[PDB]
Design a protein around this nucleic acid. Sequence first.
DNA 1: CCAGGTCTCGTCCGCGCCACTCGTGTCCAGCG
DNA 2: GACACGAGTGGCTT
DNA 3: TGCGGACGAGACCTGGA
Length: 576
Amino acid sequence: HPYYLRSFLVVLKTVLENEDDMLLFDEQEKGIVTKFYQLSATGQKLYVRLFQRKLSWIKMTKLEYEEIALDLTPVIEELTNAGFLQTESELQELSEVLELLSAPELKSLAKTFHLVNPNGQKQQLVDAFLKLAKQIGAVILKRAKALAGQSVRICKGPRAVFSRILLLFSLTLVNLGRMEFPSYTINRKTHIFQDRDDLIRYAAATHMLSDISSAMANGNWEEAKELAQCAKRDWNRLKNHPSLRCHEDLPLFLRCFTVGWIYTRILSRFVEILQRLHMYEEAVRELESLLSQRIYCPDSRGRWWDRLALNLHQHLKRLEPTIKCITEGLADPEVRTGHRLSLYQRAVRLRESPSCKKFKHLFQQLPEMAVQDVKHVTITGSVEELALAHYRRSGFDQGIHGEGSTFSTLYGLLLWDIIFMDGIPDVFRNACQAFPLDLCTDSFFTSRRPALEARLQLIHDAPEESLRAWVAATWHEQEGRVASLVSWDRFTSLQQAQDLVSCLGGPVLSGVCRHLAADFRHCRGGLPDLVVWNSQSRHFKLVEVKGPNDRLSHKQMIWLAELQKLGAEVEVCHVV
DNA sequence: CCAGGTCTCGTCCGCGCCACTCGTGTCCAGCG
DNA sequence: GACACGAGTGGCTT
DNA sequence: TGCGGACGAGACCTGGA
């Protein structure tokens, strides 16, 4: 079987094997799945290939895939009987015929009925024939279909079922069959989706969010704004619908996969575009409304407070609301790492600024958390490779451009037993899960608290050999197994990881792992990019490399201060 | 004492799967 | 009529 | 969300006065 068919079959079997997931699908949808199974291998390959393509008609001349078959003409018939593909006979909607027609063939069609400018843009000509059809339409359609040829569209019905299956799988695509996943007991005690309609709703919400992200990428913002507006209108409805209340009681990691969560991320994208369209007052209204709920996306409350403060300060030029927003944001426990530092820095800059005296300062009430200053080194001399070269010139001999993946890899290696341990409900729902589902959530440290603290303390008091024994044992058992935390390409060899942990030492590594385990989402970003060590000296310098243009991020400063606190010498290498 | 150039911090913005084949918009030199 | 560039979408991606 | 590029606004001095 080819790669795409293997991946699709893996997804299909994964969704089949979970009984709760198939509780969602109706009888005819399971019939469609079985119909897919009772097809030729060539037919399955063809349908997967068309599934990767967009839901538009494809000219039969363009469709040919030599590997699936020398000739696709029968396979098309086979899929046609089952209801998977609709051949030319169903092409009764004229707009898609025009889109199917090639532009030179558009010119030919305009010649056939030259009631309109012969030449021009494809969109313009298509609008022209569409107007012409409205004002003879049967003959126009007949000639259009005749000149187009034979085309096959992936039927909406079956494609919807396979799309929901893919959504369920990726919820928890080229190398899917080849990559093997780690060993862990599959245990789901709650249902991410309660009813089939709920998955339909989740599919609709994710489709809307994907449309808004496509508008993000294309740079089109007005359509993005109206899409976000209708999304907000939709989420204004269905709020009273009992489905949401059941979804609230869900754990945070499982609540991530809910209609409300996707609509809240859509609202966040609306905040981003509103700032992009410079409708800053509306962005402030949305951000204040976003923080009015504690239920959905508590993880992103930091960006909401930071953006609210920045909007009220430098883009609405109001100080009194800014003081309140900074104080409230620092008061919310959910803010971590960079955003807390950003709000603090805003508060301190306002404190030692003119025109802030007018009101009671309220920063006397505000806590004073100060990032420890880190040593800054500037070398003159691909900037990160240059920094590696400069440190190689120093006493240090080796180093790895971790970019935060090195600490994630070490943490995953040294805590793999706890990361994938059993006895935790719903944190592994499918046989295909690269990472435990409760990771990137505060529930990770709480649920695993005894063993997590035990292993973290052990690493804290671990001799270098014990860390090396643990890293060696875990790597041998799990090399290759998929894991979001562990990047196997990140370390050249297991000996490299052994040398790294031993050089880093048990305490500072234990602290880094503790921070990554308490809240991985906020602590993962901002780690120093470059870690350098000398094998003989066993001395390490963790270096965050920032070019002349870019300055230290708030997360980077927080992590550098924390790493210096743990006993690591950290400097920021500027290469000018 | 006043500058006008410079700095530096704060902020916005584009992308956030990649080169790759192929249908397209336009114009551009001739063409009548 | 060609047209020759770029751009863009779409497809494929072990 | 994390980058790496941009912009500009207030400081700010010092050359010149």
